[PDB]
Every structure is written in C-alpha cells, then in structure tokens.
Amino acid sequence: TKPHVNIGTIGHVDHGKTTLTAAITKVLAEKGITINTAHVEYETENRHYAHVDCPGHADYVKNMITGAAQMDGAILVVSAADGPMPQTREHILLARQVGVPYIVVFLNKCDMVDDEELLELVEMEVRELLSEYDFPGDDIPIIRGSALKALEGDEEWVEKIMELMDAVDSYIPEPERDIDKPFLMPIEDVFSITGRGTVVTGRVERGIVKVGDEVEIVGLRDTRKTVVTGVEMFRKLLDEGQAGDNVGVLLRGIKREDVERGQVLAKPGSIKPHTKFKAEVYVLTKEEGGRHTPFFNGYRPQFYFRTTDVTGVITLPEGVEMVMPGDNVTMTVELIHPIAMEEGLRFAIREGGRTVGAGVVSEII
Numbered sequence: 582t583k584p585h586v587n588i589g590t591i592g593h594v595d596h597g598k599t600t601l602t603a604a605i606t607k608v609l610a611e612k613g614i615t616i617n618t619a620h621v622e623y624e625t626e627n628r629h630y631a632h633v634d635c636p637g638h639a640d641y642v643k644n645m646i647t648g649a650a651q652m653d654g655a656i657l658v659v660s661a662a663d664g665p666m667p668q669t670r671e672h673i674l675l676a677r678q679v680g681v682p683y684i685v686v687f688l689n690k691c692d693m694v695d696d697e698e699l700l701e702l703v704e705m706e707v708r709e710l711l712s713e714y715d716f717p718g719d720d721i722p723i724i725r726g727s728a729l730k731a732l733e734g735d736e737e738w739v740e741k742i743m744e745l746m747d748a749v750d751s752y753i754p755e756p757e758r759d760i761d762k763p764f765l766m767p768i769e770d771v772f773s774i775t776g777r778g779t780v781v782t783g784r785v786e787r788g789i790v791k792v793g794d795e796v797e798i799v800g801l802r803d804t805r806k807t808v809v810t811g812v813e814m815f816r817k818l819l820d821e822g823q824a825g826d827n828v829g830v831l832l833r834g835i836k837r838e839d840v841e842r843g844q845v846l847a848k849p850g851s852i853k854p855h856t857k858f859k860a861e862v863y864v865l866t867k868e869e870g871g872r873h874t875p876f877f878n879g880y881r882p883q884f885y886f887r888t889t890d891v892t893g894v895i896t897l898p899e900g901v902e903m904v905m906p907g908d909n910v911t912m913t914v915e916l917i918h919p920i921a922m923e924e925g926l927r928f929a930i931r932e933g934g935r936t937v938g939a940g941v942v943s944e945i946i
C-alpha cells in the first residue's frame with residue numbers, strides 16, 4: 582500500500598539536523614565521487630520515507646547536485662536561538678538551483694527560547710529568506726520544536742515531532758511516477774534494416790511508447806516527427822514499451838542518416854532542444870579523480886547528457902574568475918550542438934574520458 586518519498590534535512594551546522602533525524606525515527610518507531618551520508622528509513626501512517634542527513638558542507642553540496650536519491654522535499658532545520666545563518670541561506674539557494682520541489686521548516690531549540698515575540702520574528706525572517714529564492718515562504722509550514730527534548734520523551738516536544746511529520750505527510754506531495762510522464766527515450770544505437778526500416782534502441786526513461794504512436798526526434802539536428810511501427814526485445818515483439826524497459830523501437834520513413842545516439846524520442850512538444858543553459862556544478866577534487874588545477878572563463882570541456890556528450894564553453898558568473906577542484910559554482914554553458922533538455926536535468930563534465938564535474942541544469946537560456 583505505502584508510497585515512498587525521499588527527504589532529507591538541510592540547514593546550518595549545529596542547528597539540530599542529526600538530532601532531529603534521530604527524534605523523528607525514535608518517535609515514529611514508538612508509534613570516484615565520495616559522499617558521507619546517513620540514510621534512515623521510517624514510516625508514518627501514510628508513507629514510507631528515505632531520509633538523508635549529511636555531516637559536512639561538501640556532502641550537502643554533492644548530495645544535492647549529484648544525489649543518488651533526489652529529494653522530493655527537504656526539512657529546513659533552523660535554531661530559534663540563532664536565527665538563519667550563512668549555510669541556512671546556502672542550502673536554500675542550492676535547493677532552488679537543483680529543484681528541490683518543497684520545503685518544510687522545523688524551528689529547533691524552542692526549549693531554549695521563551696519569548697513568543699522573538700520566535701515570531703525569527704519565523705518571519707525564515708519566511709522572507711525562503712521567498713528570496715522563490716520558495717512560497719507565506720505558505721510553508723513551520724513547526725516550533727525541540728529535537729533534544731523529543732528524544733527524552735517529554736510529551737509537548739514529542740508532539741511537535743508529530744506535528745512536523747503530519748506537515749511533511751500533507752505538504753510534500755508524492756513524486757509523479759515516471760510511467761505517468763510524457764514519453765521519453767534517449768537513443769543509444771541505430772540500425773537500418775531494408776525489410777523493416779530503422780530501429781533505435783535504448784531505455785524508456787519515462788511514459789509509454791505504443792505501436793502507432795507519433796514521436797519527435799529531438800536534439801543535435803532539427804526536430805522531425807514520425808510514427809512508431811514496432812517495439813521489440815530479443816525474441817519478443819511488443820505492442821508497447823514502458824519506463825524502465827530496454828527496447829528497440831522501429832520508426833517509419835527515417836533514413837539511418839537522420840537519427841543518432843544522443844537524440845531522444847519523445848512525445849511531440851514535450852521537450853525542446855537547447856544550446857544555452859545555466860547549471861550548478863560540483864567540480865571533483867584531485868582525490869575524487871578530477872582535476873588538480875583550476876579552470877577559468879574559457880574552459881571548453883565535454884558535457885555528458887543521457888546517451889551522448891557535446892563540447893560546450895563555460896562562462897563564469899560575474900566576479901568569479903577561477904574555479905578550483907572541489908568548488909561548486911553556477912556556470913553558464915553554450916554547447917556547440919543542441920540537446921533535448923529541461924531544468925533539473927543532471928549531466929557530467931569530462932575531459933579525455935576523465936570525470937571532472939557533475940552538474941544540474943538550473944535555468945534554460
């Protein structure tokens with residue numbers, strides 16, 4: 582019966598994220614690139630959660646950009662004593678750059694703060710700071726609690742943990758399943774057979790492709806349309822192929838010269854080709870197998886999107902001159918060929934087949 586949701590705690594060091602994570606688990610029970618990540622699983626009445634808490638700054642940066650999970654929502658932990666602090670802002674910004682869809686706030690350490698008027702002012706400030714980065718600060722739920730005192734079993738704080746989790750259960754919706762999204766299949770291989778026409782293999786990323794459906798071929802070249810005359814696997818002929826399936830798809834009236842790896846098939850109009858975009862990117866450290874030297878405004882490495890890579894030129898934001906191994910940066914990119922893309926799409930940066938970066942499209946230009 583029970584739906585799955587990926588969430589995780591964000592906010593400034595020491596504000597209570599790890600404590601809150603253990604309070605939530607305690608209470609609910611009673612009822613290459615390296616990322617340090619504590620994962621816990623727990624349940625409410627209505628839902629199953631996979632929850633990540635990170636120790637270090639770098640970990641949040643890397644988990645957010647090059648995940649593993651992808652957060653359907655985040656719990657912003659903020660100390661009522663202190664107020665929002667620099668990493669409060671940084672994590673809000675990152676969540677916006679990478680497309681964390683919803684936020685719920687837990688104002689923590691309310692056991693250290695009598696004075697209702699002060700709590701309201703800290704609350705108003707959290708709200709404004711959320712709205713600076715276009716989250717709807719006026720409607721976000723903010724619960725006032727104490728993770729410490731909830732683990733001691735103190736009743737009023739145990740109930741604030743439940744108030745949080747009720748809020749999460751209601752305000753953070755379940756992610757749209759991939760099968761209910763517009764059809765999309767990145768193309769891996771292309772075969773021309775004289776008997777049949779041209780078939781493109783790959784994995785359906787989303788939706789359903791049905792024999793007789795019409796699809797666009799998007800990216801690299803100009804968007805052409807066609808109709809699907811066949812779906813297949815090794816000795817099976819199928820009427821359709823769905824999200825997760827590896828299939829060959831037979832296309833009608835398509836010369837082999839007119840499709841290639843890196844293009845996608847897609848429901849007509851569902852996705853458009855682009856060369857220019859903004860992205861948040863994490864640059865790997867020497868130790869992660871990345872660069873050991875900085876790069877600058879000209880830099881022109883390979884961008885890997887779905888099944889292919891395209892050369893692109895990187896422009897740094899105003900007042901950033903260099904990027905070191907281990908930084909994260911918002912960069913603007915112009916690729917030499919268009920690629921089917923949307924905000925939220927993740928990609929790698931490589932040079933000579935060696936991974937130097939991981940990124941996500943934050944804005945299409």
Ligand SMILES: Nc1nc2c(ncn2[C@@H]2O[C@H](COP(=O)(O)OP(=O)(O)O)[C@@H](O)[C@H]2O)c(=O)[nH]1
Pocket residue numbers: 593594595596597598599600601689690691692693726727728729730
């Ligand atoms: N007074 C009080 N202290 C807390 C509360 N939650 C956490 N702390 C304390 O603040 C410190 C940092 O908490 P922790 O969960 O490690 O912070 P994190 O870095 O955000 O994960 C620890 O000493 C906690 O015991 C709370 O609800 N009330």
Ligand SMILES: [Mg+2]
Pocket residue numbers: 595598599600634635636
């Ligand atoms: Mg912690």
